Amino acid sequence: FVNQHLCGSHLVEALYLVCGERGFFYTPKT
Amino acid sequence: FVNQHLCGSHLVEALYLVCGERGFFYTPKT
Amino acid sequence: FVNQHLCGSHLVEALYLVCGERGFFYTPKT
Amino acid sequence: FVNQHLCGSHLVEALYLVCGERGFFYTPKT
Amino acid sequence: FVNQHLCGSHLVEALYLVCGERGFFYTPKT
Amino acid sequence: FVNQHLCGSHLVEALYLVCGERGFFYTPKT
Amino acid sequence: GIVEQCCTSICSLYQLENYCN
Amino acid sequence: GIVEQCCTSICSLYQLENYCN
Amino acid sequence: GIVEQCCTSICSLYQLENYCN
Amino acid sequence: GIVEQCCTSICSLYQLENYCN
Amino acid sequence: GIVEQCCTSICSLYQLENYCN
Amino acid sequence: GIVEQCCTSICSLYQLENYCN
Ligand SMILES: [Cl-]
Ligand SMILES: [Cl-]
Ligand SMILES: [Zn+2]
Ligand SMILES: [Zn+2]
């Protein structure tokens, strides 16, 4: 895998693909 | 607004939209 | 709901999620 | 180009791609 | 069709829509 | 990580994620 | 859970807020 | 409409232009 | 307009909803 | 091919790397 | 190349189509 | 955090995986 530059909803897509059925939590600063 | 089927990446994109900075959890196992 | 920072196709995704079956019109300047 | 099934958010993403600054309407009720 | 300003994964979406069943190759610099 | 169904634009988004600068080919005819 | 509420069955944007932090 | 033309049945990028403003 | 505002500034879903049909 | 491996059947992120250049 | 051009500048769908298989 | 790091800098899928449930 390569490093990622992910903003906004693209981070959420990536988490989705990475975590699959485990799901994930999305916790931005502030 | 409306009710639609939101699945998979689309569901998490909707969560991102709706929660934004609050963050959210996507826990499909539930 | 939180405020949104939406560019490009992300605005269209958001309109899609917001409007659902009503659909929507996308009308950029110029 | 090609013909494929374009549904939901994917359909509006395609409209955004194809229309861009012209804008477009997505009116699924029709 | 209109000209496109496409970064990151948006380019890949566009290639996908443009190429359909032909598929495509995505070859960034470096 | 996980195994999920990755189809269509989602498949190419996953390839973009996983390959990034290496680039990739999407050749559904195979 | 969210998948049953929003994917399998349908949910509003408001119901989606149930899954915000 | 567009859903029938492009989702239910298939449409080209050119047909999609039918829905531009 | 809304397209510019959401991108250069911020916009709310409620503002977005004005663009629904 | 990739569609059979990853869409029709399921594949890991590692299998997806099979299609990188 | 195309990846850079579409992002730093603009590119057309016709230019994109050159990357189809 | 990860949300900021992936956007302002870069992040890896392995770092992302830490946010899975
Ligand atoms: Cl973006
Ligand atoms: Cl889908
Ligand atoms: Zn984007
Ligand atoms: Zn989809």
From Swiss-Prot, chains A, B, C, D, E, F:
Superkingdom to which the source organism belongs: Eukaryota
What changing residue 24 to S does, per the record, is: In HPRI; Los-Angeles
Listed name of the protein: Insulin B chain
Species of the source: Homo sapiens
Q: What is the lineage of its organism?
A: Eukaryota, Metazoa, Chordata, Craniata, Vertebrata
